[PDB]
Design a protein around this ligand. Structure first.
Ligand code: SKM
Ligand code: SKM
Lengths: 261, 259
């Protein structure tokens, strides 16, 4: 049967096991999807094991960027993004892909979020780079910001976007939190309330808590909002199709993650 | 659903569609595996179609070598062999593999054919190259022969093996006939191995003089059907992560053949 896993640290709280358990039974397939705590230093040995006993694995912090160097092939998109969130194992070879980017666009459509810019992505790490890549592919005007400017500049220069100071958030029509600010901390938000735009939409990739301070601020501000679950479900469904050629129902996977938190 | 196909010219006599229909059915999967005649000229265009509508395809004569130039990635083994018989499509990208080699070895293993050396491979084509590579990596002393001398010497040089005269077949303990281009052996009965095993890479035939001669000589024998089933089951797993029963696939083919 199909052996899958999400590698990272921390991963004991991942909702992927629940989503793909649904995927497997839903498609009538026998298999498992476990959470395997993997610290950066353990990554090399961990991928060696993946080559022998797993059909595929998802990668999460802090392994998405370091993984590229240990793979046999990286997709053109994952190369530009500089992060791989999905690995396929065939004949002991590892192929890297990024389903965070396409998953994000699918989630936006599923949420009725209009593809209207300027779209400001907060955070220029792996997740932020994937979101910026996806919004660029969708043809929107994209702005990027990062606590450390050079990271946002590098991204804007590489993708041909615009790096902006944080206060430009008031002029964005779509705001996406791709930072980890807010993770398990209801008191923290990456953006001061007064910097939110008075109209538009906001999406948060952080889904622990589900209704983060950022999202609650955005909703109260008069912005249309979307939690991080739709993207989580779509990037997962897309990864499952990469591994098997079959697409499990994204909404079903979303529902499964919702019940798992 | 899952869409697969075997591309080649001719492919009207391929037993792959029969075997994979069983693979899909037995594994409770929805999909199809069709034979699609593909002359060498339609190959570039056919692969473009594969990128968009098929999860994977098998390639047979005369596409195994010409296909490499049109793929995004080729496995180390397929590169050395110089032939790709299995293509996987993910996100519109094409990856080439060679399941002929591992399928051959697994078929010998499952069929109880001992890897007794020296082994001799007759024929240096896509199948012959895959077989020689497989036997070499298995640790055997491997000899090669070809109707055309230069062909055998080139293969011997590339893989670090030895090209030998037809008479050396008497000293081989594992004899493989890979001269069956597209379904009479070139080996006189008097030059057959003294002891050991003979494998005839022929898929449709129930029997062959080559095999009857080997059997009579007291050699353990095997046709090419087990290899076809195994290269096919391995291809299916490459495509989906699921391995269909190789024995089941072989039986499906035999029933299709009416023997
Ligand atoms: O929480 C999780 O299990 C995941 C989170 C994201 O990094 C995804 O990109 C990853 O595939 C799995
Ligand atoms: O006849 C067939 O359908 C096949 C023949 C061999 O060349 C195999 O390598 C191919 O994958 C399938």
């Amino acid at each position: 049967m199909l052996r899958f896993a999400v590698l990272g640290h921390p991963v004991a709280h991942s909702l992927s096991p629940a989503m793909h358990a649904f995927a497997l039974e839903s498609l009538g397939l026998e298999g498992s999807y476990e959470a395997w705590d993997t610290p950066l230093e353990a990554l090399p040995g961990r991928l060696k094991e993946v080559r022998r006993a797993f059909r595929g694995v998802n990668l999460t912090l802090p392994l998405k960027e370091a993984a590229l160097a240990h793979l046999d092939w990286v997709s053109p998109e994952a190369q530009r993004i500089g992060a791989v969130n999905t690995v396929l194992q065939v004949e002991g070879r590892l192929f890297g892909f990024n389903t965070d980017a396409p998953g994000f666009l699918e989630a936006l459509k599923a949420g009725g979020i209009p593809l209207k810019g300027p779209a400001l992505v907060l955070g220029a790490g792996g997740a932020g780079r994937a979101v910026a890549f996806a919004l660029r592919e969708a043809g929107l005007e994209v702005w990027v910001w990062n606590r450390t400017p050079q990271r946002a500049l590098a991204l804007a220069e590489e993708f041909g976007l615009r790096a902006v100071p944080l206060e430009k958030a008031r002029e964005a029509r779509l705001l996406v939190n791709a930072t980890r600010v807010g993770l398990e901390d209801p008191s923290a938000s990456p953006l001061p309330a007064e910097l939110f735009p008075e109209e538009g939409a906001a999406v948060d990739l952080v889904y622990r808590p589900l209704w983060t301070r950022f999202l609650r601020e955005a909703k109260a501000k008069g912005l249309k909002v979307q939690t991080g679950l739709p993207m989580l479900a779509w990037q997962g469904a897309l990864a499952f199709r990469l591994w098997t050629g079959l697409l499990p129902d994204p909404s079903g996977m979303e529902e499964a993650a919702r019940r798992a938190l």
